[PDB]
Design an enzyme around this catalytic site. Sequence first.
Site, PDB file in Angstrom:
ATOM      1  N   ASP A   1      15.621  26.913  28.094  1.00 59.67           N
ATOM      2  CA  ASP A   1      14.868  28.174  28.260  1.00 59.67           C
ATOM      3  C   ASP A   1      14.767  28.736  26.846  1.00 59.67           C
ATOM      4  O   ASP A   1      15.800  29.130  26.310  1.00 59.67           O
ATOM      5  CB  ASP A   1      15.601  29.101  29.231  1.00 59.67           C
ATOM      6  CG  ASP A   1      15.249  30.574  29.122  1.00 59.67           C
ATOM      7  OD1 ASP A   1      14.126  30.883  28.713  1.00 59.67           O
ATOM      8  OD2 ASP A   1      16.113  31.401  29.453  1.00 59.67           O
TER       9      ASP A   1
ATOM     10  N   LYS B   1       8.610  33.989  19.457  1.00 54.26           N
ATOM     11  CA  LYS B   1       7.867  33.679  20.703  1.00 54.26           C
ATOM     12  C   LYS B   1       6.679  34.636  20.801  1.00 54.26           C
ATOM     13  O   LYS B   1       5.680  34.261  21.418  1.00 54.26           O
ATOM     14  CB  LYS B   1       8.807  33.804  21.901  1.00 54.26           C
ATOM     15  CG  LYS B   1       8.331  33.154  23.189  1.00 54.26           C
ATOM     16  CD  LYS B   1       9.376  33.231  24.267  1.00 54.26           C
ATOM     17  CE  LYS B   1       8.901  32.677  25.588  1.00 54.26           C
ATOM     18  NZ  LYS B   1       9.959  32.761  26.620  1.00 54.26           N
TER      19      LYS B   1
ATOM     20  N   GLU C   1       8.396  29.605  33.474  1.00 49.03           N
ATOM     21  CA  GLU C   1       9.754  30.165  33.673  1.00 49.03           C
ATOM     22  C   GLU C   1       9.937  30.644  35.120  1.00 49.03           C
ATOM     23  O   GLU C   1      11.006  30.365  35.675  1.00 49.03           O
ATOM     24  CB  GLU C   1      10.001  31.278  32.656  1.00 49.03           C
ATOM     25  CG  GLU C   1      10.048  30.795  31.223  1.00 49.03           C
ATOM     26  CD  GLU C   1       9.882  31.888  30.186  1.00 49.03           C
ATOM     27  OE1 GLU C   1       9.721  31.553  29.005  1.00 49.03           O
ATOM     28  OE2 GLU C   1       9.913  33.069  30.561  1.00 49.03           O
TER      29      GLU C   1
ATOM     30  N   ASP D   1      11.560  39.452  36.505  1.00 46.88           N
ATOM     31  CA  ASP D   1      12.277  39.019  35.279  1.00 46.88           C
ATOM     32  C   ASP D   1      12.371  40.215  34.329  1.00 46.88           C
ATOM     33  O   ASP D   1      11.334  40.598  33.770  1.00 46.88           O
ATOM     34  CB  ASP D   1      11.572  37.821  34.639  1.00 46.88           C
ATOM     35  CG  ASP D   1      12.336  37.185  33.491  1.00 46.88           C
ATOM     36  OD1 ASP D   1      13.438  37.667  33.180  1.00 46.88           O
ATOM     37  OD2 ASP D   1      11.817  36.208  32.920  1.00 46.88           O
TER      38      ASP D   1
HETATM   39  O1  LIG Z   1      12.631  36.829  27.418  1.00 54.56           O
HETATM   40  C1  LIG Z   1      11.952  35.851  27.811  1.00 54.56           C
HETATM   41  O2  LIG Z   1      11.403  35.097  26.987  1.00 54.56           O
HETATM   42  C2  LIG Z   1      11.809  35.556  29.309  1.00 54.56           C
HETATM   43  N1  LIG Z   1      13.017  35.977  30.007  1.00 54.56           N
HETATM   44  C3  LIG Z   1      13.971  34.875  30.253  1.00 54.56           C
HETATM   45  C4  LIG Z   1      14.842  34.610  29.018  1.00 54.56           C
HETATM   46  O3  LIG Z   1      14.229  33.554  28.340  1.00 54.56           O
HETATM   47  C5  LIG Z   1      13.227  33.582  30.616  1.00 54.56           C
HETATM   48  O4  LIG Z   1      12.642  33.730  31.879  1.00 54.56           O
HETATM   49  C6  LIG Z   1      14.933  35.280  31.375  1.00 54.56           C
HETATM   50  O5  LIG Z   1      15.198  36.645  31.206  1.00 54.56           O
HETATM   51  K   LIG Z   2      11.757  29.898  28.345  1.00 51.34           K
HETATM   52  K   LIG Z   3      10.520  38.381  31.076  1.00 51.08           K
END
Ligand SMILES: O=C(O)CNC(CO)(CO)CO
Ligand SMILES: [K+]
Ligand SMILES: [K+]
Length: 539
Positions: A7, A68, A172, A196
């Site tokens: 992740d 990112k 994700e 999320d």
């Molecule tokens: O912050 C992000 O990039 C997305 N949120 C998660 C951390 O990578 C992935 O789903 C989970 O909280």
């Molecule tokens: K990810």
């Molecule tokens: K998120």
Amino acid sequence: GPAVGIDLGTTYSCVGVFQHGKVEIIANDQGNRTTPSYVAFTDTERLIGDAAKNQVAMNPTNTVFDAKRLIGRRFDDAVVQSDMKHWPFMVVNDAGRPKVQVEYKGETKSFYPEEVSSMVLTKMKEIAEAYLGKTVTNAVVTVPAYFNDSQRQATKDAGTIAGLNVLRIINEPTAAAIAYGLDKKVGAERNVLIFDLGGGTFDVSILTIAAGIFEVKSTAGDTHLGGEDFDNRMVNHFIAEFKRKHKKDISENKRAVRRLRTACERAKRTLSSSTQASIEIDSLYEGIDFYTSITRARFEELNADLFRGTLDPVEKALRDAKLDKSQIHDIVLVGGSTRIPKIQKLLQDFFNGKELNKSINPDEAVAYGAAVQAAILSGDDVTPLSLGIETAGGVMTVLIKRNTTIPTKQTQTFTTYSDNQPGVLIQVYEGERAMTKDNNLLGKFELTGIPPAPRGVPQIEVTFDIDANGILNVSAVDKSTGKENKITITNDKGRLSKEDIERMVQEAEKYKAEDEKQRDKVSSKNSLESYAFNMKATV
Ligand SMILES: O=C(O)CNC(CO)(CO)CO
Ligand SMILES: [K+]
Ligand SMILES: [K+]
């Protein structure tokens, strides 16, 4: 060797492996199951992970984070421009491609966003290798569902630089659902809402899962809302309290603010499990010790707008998915901030008491799903596609939706699009796209002898019947005369593979906005023409 699931998150990254029938989230050198997505450059060395975050205050200009946010984007983008304001590191224009400027070993050095992400992936690969004892090349890397092809390619390139063979890039939200095994649940079209709430980002995704196939119906959220914002509200409150109690503003001292922020982060974690939390800082400012407490209710009051605003993206996602809240069958909590009791209460009350799937650690669920998918790629009766006929303009009008239990019989009534139309051409198509050109043609038949009439007056009843074998019979009847014509379409075994269905669903997700506009253009939903729009020599 075994493949790993990674992740790659804006604030933190996690790596998991499926070994001996079990998924294990791999801890780093300092024993942490999550590694900060931070790369730090110093006069003597390059630091990745926890070490980089620990020294960020000392070297803000050379510590990089939120890559990112810049991956697969352009320097001109409003997102890139707006984000630069809060970043201590320098972002520079390189022919419109964003790059980060840092000092490394006395030479100023510039790196692509994918290059920064590659360094984070390198640490996660090393963390996995140390735990496994074997080199790890194969990996599955997750991306936000809203990511475009360039952002997904940039993520794959980061792994390629890291030495990883990226078997697949997966959403994700889809990874979180795989971790909870929602795909393996029996039945038809389960609707899933993934909530999320990460450290800096909020994502709400609605997924429809049917026969092991995932479709992203909708996405919504705030890219700038997360746990850190909740910590900031606590920090501002404590600075105001010190100013009232001791008549001093500690904002001038950077170390004092940093110490308070660390205490606030610890207090927020305590408030998740306890009614109150204690703040104890010695000599915070001008020798004055700050000893104080905060209740969970005060924390909720400080963050009330942020906590309640979480429902607004949930409402937008339901509207975009054209689903009522009642139609959601599963809700999954992802991200550490989802541990906060007020957020869970707000979501459960909004869903009228529905239970929330929180059982897997919220910080590790996406990596867990990625690991299961990596293992499946490595060693480790329902209808496959929507069925419909072409309406005027080459539009696909669906009579049988995808994942409808068979046997089934569906009938709709259609009319002529032109005055005195002699006949209608029934063109049967399979696919999830708005236009027939983007769908697959299964068969065609003609109904003729229609009595001359104005457009919209002739009534033609089309029926789709699937006998349990899966054989589709399409019939059309002129309601005025009872005259009829029909086609029998054979269901060849293995015509569509699982991947074939997945590719067509993914194409529909990629072009959903454009597809909707094409549906909006035609005034009448069920008007039939006498010709194939695809074979017309016009525009
Ligand atoms: O912050 C992000 O990039 C997305 N949120 C998660 C951390 O990578 C992935 O789903 C989970 O909280
Ligand atoms: K990810
Ligand atoms: K998120």
